[PDB]
Amino acid sequence: MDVLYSLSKTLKDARDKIVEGTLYSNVSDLIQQFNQMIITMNGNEFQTGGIGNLPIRNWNFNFGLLGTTLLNLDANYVETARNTIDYFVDFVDNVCMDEMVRESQRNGIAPQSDSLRKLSAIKFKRINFDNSSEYIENWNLQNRRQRTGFTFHKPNIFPYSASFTLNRSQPAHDNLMGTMWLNAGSEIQVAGFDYSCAINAPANIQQFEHIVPLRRVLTTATITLLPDAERFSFPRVINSADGATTWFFNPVILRPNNVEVEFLLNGQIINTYQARFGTIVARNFDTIRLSFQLMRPPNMTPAVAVLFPNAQPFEHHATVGLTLRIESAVCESVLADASETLLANVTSVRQEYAIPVGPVFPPGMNWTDLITNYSPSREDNLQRVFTVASIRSMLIK
Amino acid sequence: MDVLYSLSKTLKDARDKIVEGTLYSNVSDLIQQFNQMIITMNGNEFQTGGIGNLPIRNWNFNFGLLGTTLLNLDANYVETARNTIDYFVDFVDNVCMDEMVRESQRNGIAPQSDSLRKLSAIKFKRINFDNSSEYIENWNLQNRRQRTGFTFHKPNIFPYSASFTLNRSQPAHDNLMGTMWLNAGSEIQVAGFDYSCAINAPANIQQFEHIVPLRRVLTTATITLLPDAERFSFPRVINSADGATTWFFNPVILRPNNVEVEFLLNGQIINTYQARFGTIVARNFDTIRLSFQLMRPPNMTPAVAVLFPNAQPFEHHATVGLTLRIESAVCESVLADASETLLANVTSVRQEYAIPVGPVFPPGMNWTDLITNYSPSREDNLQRVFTVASIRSMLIK
Amino acid sequence: MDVLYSLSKTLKDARDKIVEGTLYSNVSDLIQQFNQMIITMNGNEFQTGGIGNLPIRNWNFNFGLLGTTLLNLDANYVETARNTIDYFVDFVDNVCMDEMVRESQRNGIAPQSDSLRKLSAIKFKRINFDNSSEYIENWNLQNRRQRTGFTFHKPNIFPYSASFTLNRSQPAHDNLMGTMWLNAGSEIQVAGFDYSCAINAPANIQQFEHIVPLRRVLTTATITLLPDAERFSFPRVINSADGATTWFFNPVILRPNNVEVEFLLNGQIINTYQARFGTIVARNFDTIRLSFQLMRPPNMTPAVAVLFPNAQPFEHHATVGLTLRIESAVCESVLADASETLLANVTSVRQEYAIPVGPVFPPGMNWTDLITNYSPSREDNLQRVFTVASIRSMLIK
Amino acid sequence: MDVLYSLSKTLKDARDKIVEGTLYSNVSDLIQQFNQMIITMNGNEFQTGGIGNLPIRNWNFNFGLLGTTLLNLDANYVETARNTIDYFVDFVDNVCMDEMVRESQRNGIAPQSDSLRKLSAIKFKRINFDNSSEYIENWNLQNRRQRTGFTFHKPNIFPYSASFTLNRSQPAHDNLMGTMWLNAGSEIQVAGFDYSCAINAPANIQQFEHIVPLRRVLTTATITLLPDAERFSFPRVINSADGATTWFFNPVILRPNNVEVEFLLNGQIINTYQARFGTIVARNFDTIRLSFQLMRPPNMTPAVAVLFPNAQPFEHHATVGLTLRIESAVCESVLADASETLLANVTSVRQEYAIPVGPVFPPGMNWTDLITNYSPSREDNLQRVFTVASIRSMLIK
Amino acid sequence: MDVLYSLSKTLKDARDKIVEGTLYSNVSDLIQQFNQMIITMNGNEFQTGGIGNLPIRNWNFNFGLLGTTLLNLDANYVETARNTIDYFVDFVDNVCMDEMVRESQRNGIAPQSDSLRKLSAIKFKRINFDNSS
Amino acid sequence: FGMQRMHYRNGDPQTPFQIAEQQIQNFQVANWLHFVNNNYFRQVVIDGVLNQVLNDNIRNGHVINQLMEALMQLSRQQFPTMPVDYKRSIQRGILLLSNRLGQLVDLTRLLAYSYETLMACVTMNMQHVQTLTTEKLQLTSVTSLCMLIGNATVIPSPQTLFHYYNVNVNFHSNYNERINDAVAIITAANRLNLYQ
Amino acid sequence: FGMQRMHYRNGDPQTPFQIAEQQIQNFQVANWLHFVNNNYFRQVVIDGVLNQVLNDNIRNGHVINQLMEALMQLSRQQFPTMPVDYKRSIQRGILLLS
């Protein structure tokens, strides 16, 4: 696998440094690297494609070398090197395009394409310029059974699943007590609503809780806990759970009282924060448990007193809400992000040539279903395909 | 263009590599490049400025070469490096500033400033140390007539234009049926509202459509999709159509029905997703068509059964809404973004000396005005200006 | 602190370039640097720990020079190199972690631990591989007292203070007029409410003001501007200013006019924007001034005239709202961000190893408490700890 | 790409010059060229076809040379050369036939066919006879980022879209005021009709305007503005806009008064002409805005007075018309013309073997849809296919 | 006016035939014509403009003979040739544009601008590539 | 391999072997040249005496095989652009040197052991600095040694070794004693304010 | 110092040593070259008698240390693109004078 990254990095560096007029004493290293690459590459053919509409292509390799005779590069030397470089770039692009689409249920961390499988042979192991890039370095470190990591921005890890769970319910929905939450992207907003407004509640306090799991362990998460949620603070009319009737929602946002935020790992308490708003830091967590209390106003005013009639007739329900955002995090496994187009590259390459759905990736690369039931084989296959995608995105801008 | 980036890279690498202690075999190539540069530039002259409040200076070059041979670099070499590097930094800063605020109409991609015009001749063609970045390499590839591209995070491609279209109006504004949408920054939020819950159209289903154009081609974009409007769910009073009166708006939200999102190219369907809320990806599109249907719920409960009367007077109107946000994309042409520091650099340098408005760019770099009538000449000028700004941003830290 | 950065860079380069196959001509510089570092690091003993739960460990350095013979690095040479690479990585990790958990009023720039004091002597200055990264180069520029700065995306610079003021108020809760706003991270949203809808107010125009100071200076900042309230346009119940009961809020949103944004620096007006939304750019400022006016609409419609009676009992008070988001910034003093995670690393180390509270940082690395009372000693200590964190964050990924 | 043009031009020149009896001292250049071509061509096989019904063919190359022994060409030498030449002509024709059909969404300016891609390799770059032909010279100049052009006759650039826009309309179409225009080919004819005949018009003058955009900038356009349009000067009966009713049209052609012709570029005024008929010259334009006035006859005669009753009953509507023709123009991008069969060749080759519609070209190569939504990638792909088509049309007459 | 046509034809032929790869036996005539034109155009100074908005510019010609050694024209030779080809194209464009904007009753056939008057002397008549158009 | 012969200017910091390493393509010959290029001594402090020690790949004599394989490759290429007789003579020379592989291995191991044992008997610091007077040595003697070595080992005689060690330590002690005497006299003279 | 041989024209108003001073950034030899560049007879008057006298710095014998330091700096210099024996002899003679 590392051979492909070495080839891509060498090609990019050569395209960067070989420009007209530069002194040869600054590209001696790259000249030696390129000559070694040409010496080892020649004489071995390749085949790519064969599945779907992907163009089947055959490959040959017969090229000269880059001698050392000049003192400053002229136009003609640069042109010859550039002509070879563009062909090698096309080769890398086509090999990657072949590799990205396919997959396998077993051995999903090993190469699959014929060209890549032949490249993994020992006689090609003399070309490895560096491993400075993030994804290739992580792959190399993961090769030797070591802890890894990924610097991610807005690391979407929460699956999209809009759901609510009622706690107290009239048959015709006139006295409701429950919770509404919506986990979109890397944003969690949880709201706790009551119709009684704590007029008949025990000790005039209503208890709210909500637990959201996480399939993959993160680290170093800067958490912005902002109260006064926005997802449920406006009139609504939605169908009931059984899908045979509807209900109304007339909200009033109160002050969330005694906000408790807990981060757990392996079933133990790791980091806790009481009644703090703003930005907080969590170091290691796998399950998030948000709980708080809704407190009835101890004293009211005419408008407020009318707005919460003690008796059953209700026309204004009360609700409190919180917002959970992950503005930064580091994970141990590959995940979708927003600082690149890796998942975008995978989706585009999958859809462009209409490869029939295999046995691992759900159809259309819909991220919701892919992240729903996370399994280690799926994670390994996604890691390999994302490494190949990052290789592609480091050649074509 | 390329020469300026070469100078900037050489100076930055020299200031990041020349310090007491390091071995001589560590910065040999940089010393060779530095001597080549000082040989080439020596003995010439330049004079930048001559417009706006920017002062006019005259530059010379007489600095001597290096060549000291020490196993450990000492502080005398460091002192000479500091002095010469500072002088070259000031020179490159001044020439970049002069290149900034000048614009031309015909052949805008061509250099404008006299210093840069003299700096692209044949005798300056030696020093081209390296081109290792995104913008400069994209410029170099464009000069070779190949595909271009840039990375982005939440691009601002939609000019702010808050507009609302009506399908059925009334002089009294007591009975409305129409749509409202806004597109600011990287967000599009569309909503279609009805007052009678479509008891006048067949099958009790009203179908709004929406079409939004894109001023430039986009590829490999991941889309966050939300099925509930965020902006049009509050009691609002808005201006009328003729700018003569004010109308009321009392919204309530239902579930969107048969949601279709279409990314079309040349009017042809490429990416389509139905009821896929969360994260979706589109490969290549230039036109966005959104269609959703507001459906009267079949079965009701007292609250909703009364709040939607079939008679004339209304207390609450019905509306549905979608929030579409693009988080990352790659474009073949130069575009600004809120995730970098380019447009800010351009406007700061422009307002630094109160330059009169150029014959191409709109006044004060009002981004909306620039993106409105997006012209190819303006595109080329924007490309050149942003490239020069990126060259400048590599030094002033 | 440069020696630590050089050591980290050398270790990363060795771990990323020394793999079986690479030509020796590509790692000759790295081998020379490694040999120099090892020969200058022999015959010295170091001790780390003594505070927190860090186990006190002692270290030796009796490692011979690496091999310098083979044309291609085979497996055995790589294993021999790693036999000391692992030890070096562990040592650097322990040293940086030990340094991270100590601070004081004085010695704001100078290191405080024993390891950095001993390493930064004259003789060890022979080791400096480069200064390519951002933070170390900014630190070196600061040591010469020159222009400094960084780049971030959506930085939390505005502290948390959810405050509101009332201009005309009484315990009747029928005639209220004031402004309420929220400041979390970089999201400044202001709202001005007026119960009377400016009926008795002179000239039918009511003027609001709001002033927010910044703890530091931001240059070339891009800001997204929106005209409508997005967080204070829903019914609410809020307590009193001093606190005896709660009042009621039911907002209706107009379109504010004469929306003027001032970027004031040292009492001098620099950038002025009138009636503009979308994209706004300020070259340099240290304070934000916001101004808007409420205009009772001249013409009316029955659904509007029924909600602003000239009489005393009101039902829906008028309110406007503005959204101000800083989506990119370049600052002079060190500040936390959303893209980077150094603050996360520091807080993670502190929480994991249970450091006793010092007289400088607020407990638990609470960012809001840290920024509410920014002091130069805090700034220097935080710059030091952040540079150490950035050095650490490229060795254990 | 240039290799193919060189081959075609060399083959045509050889077929032109090698005739029986000519003196050898006049074909020495072509003999050297042919010998070099045979030397470089031999030993490399080729493959073409594989998609649709196109015949897959394999290719070999084993031929002698053309020695220098004679003083005047005899029949046998000419026959041998001709036998080789016809085979090479078949080779070029088949390669072009393979190349024309295919396309690509990305990199749509680079070669795609396997034979062409192999031809682009460096070792074939020794054959370039000239670049005198228009299309190949334009391609070569466009390769190096330079302004281009095309001498076109009747350059159809206006899409076909028959449409009208009413201004004053009775429900049953008895009092109409509006415009009819039809843009066919390179011919624009705009008519402005009124039913009132300016009897109730303000100031007895009716204002007419019409703006037609253009997707591609032209230059040096000789414009023949002839009044008295013919497209709408005869009785008509057409369906209404909603397609639920029809209307009548009884026209009378009056004298168009104060004809104003404006040519704009980038939103500014470039060239204007008032009250001039015949031929005019425009140098640079992108949008055409035709406006004029219809003047009521100040005095009438019995028949005329009866023909325009002041009251509502109408039986003769009045109309003025203009005709816009582009008898010559030069563009910057490839476009359909009438001086060749290039678009005809593309359409014929596409339809003959029934290649399924790809992702760029709309089905059937219908020029209307292709020119409707013009995008730069489509323009580049069309440029490449038209260059290949012009190559084909320069071999088979 | 023949000299201007010859110059234009030579410039077009040079810009269309001098690309990396063509055998020298196909451009020997063009190289000879180019060398003759350059050696006959050295040591003279021209001025164009003075009327309209045409910016007055001055021109020199101190360009050495092109290379005459390589069997196949490589990239460096092409770049050296273009280093003066661009200048020649600009000069011819400016001269013809200057001539285009002047006319009078007399001198109907004879040129009126200074550039054509100076170019059409006896000594410069050494340059005439063809009259094919 | 029939590549254009190099013109190594007399005075470049690079060495001809370095350029050859950067030029040729074949594996074994390039590896051997690379080994001979950067093979430097190692400074090792033992028992308070600084010494120069060869690389461990030279004492066990395995590197000679890494030589011979390369030489063996030299016998496979066709030697283009050369007459047959020149190739025949070169092949004869390389074969004569090759058939004596065991003799060379034994000689190299003997040289390594003898050098280590003898050099371990010096007690003054040594440095690798070129001096003015240079030793003259023709290569014909080296060819004779490589072609004439046999089977009997040679170990330095203990009596000669002890005599050499005694002479060396005597010289070092004399040098140190004279140094101390001179330092004492000069220090006393300069502290007694003597200036005439 | 690996620089091209000094192309020069006889009769320039500036001596070649000035050009050497403003072309070499090696502090020791550059400073020594500057000192030699601006070393001129000093015009003084003593008891009504005009005389030309040397500078004080050379008078006490101090410039020799600067010359020795510059020569020793040149001694260990790489001296590139020069044959073996010539360079060895040059640097050994420099050491002899130092």
UniProtKB/TrEMBL annotation, chain E:
Highest taxon above the source species: Viruses
Annotated GO CC locations: T=13 icosahedral viral capsid; viral envelope; viral intermediate capsid
BP terms from Gene Ontology: fusion of virus membrane with host plasma membrane
Compartment list: Virion
Region of interest (Interaction with the inner capsid protein VP2), ranges: 62-73
Keywords for the protein's UniProt record, in alphabetical order: Calcium, Capsid protein, Intermediate capsid protein, Metal-binding, Ubl conjugation, Virion, Zinc
Signal peptide interval: none
PTM entry text: Sumoylated with SUMO1 and SUMO2. Sumoylation of viral proteins seems to have a positive role on viral replication.
Function noted in UniProt: Intermediate capsid protein that self assembles to form an icosahedral capsid with a T=13 symmetry, which consists of 230 trimers of VP6, with channels at each of its five-fold vertices. This capsid constitutes the middle concentric layer of the viral mature particle. The innermost VP2 capsid and the intermediate VP6 capsid remain intact following cell entry to protect the dsRNA from degradation and to prevent unfavorable antiviral responses in the host cell during all the replication cycle of the virus.
Assembly with partners or alone: Homotrimer. Interacts with the inner capsid protein VP2. Interacts with the outer capsid glycoprotein VP7. Interacts with the outer capsid protein VP5*.
Miscellaneous note of the record: The VP6 trimer contains a zinc ion located at the center of the molecule. The zinc ion is not essential for either trimerization or transcription activity of the DLP. Zinc-depleted VP6 has an increased sensitivity to proteases.
Name this protein carries in UniProt: Intermediate capsid protein VP6
Originating species: Rotavirus A
UniProtKB/TrEMBL annotation, chain G:
Name of protein: Inner capsid protein VP2
Post-translational modification: Sumoylated with SUMO1 and SUMO2. Sumoylation of viral proteins seems to have a positive role on viral replication.
Organism: Rotavirus A
Top-level lineage group: Viruses
Residues of the full protein shown: 442 to 539 of 882
UniProt function note: Inner capsid protein that self-assembles to form an icosahedral capsid with a T=2 symmetry, which consists of 120 copies of VP2, with channels at each of its five-fold vertices. This capsid constitutes the innermost concentric layer of the viral mature particle. It encapsidates the polymerase VP1, the capping enzyme VP3 and the genomic dsRNA, thereby defining the core.
Notes on the domains: The N-terminus binds RNA. It is necessary for encapsidation of VP1 and VP3. The N-termini of 10 VP2 molecules form a cylindrical hub underneath each 5-fold axis of the inner capsid.
Family stated for the protein in its record: Belongs to the rotavirus VP2 family.
Complex and partners: Homodecamer; each decamer is made up of two conformers of VP2, called VP2A and VP2B. Interacts with a VP1-VP3 complex. Interacts with the intermediate capsid protein VP6. Interacts with NSP5. Interacts (via N-terminus) with NSP2.
Subcellular location: Virion
Gene name tied to this protein: VP2
Residues spanning the signal sequence: none
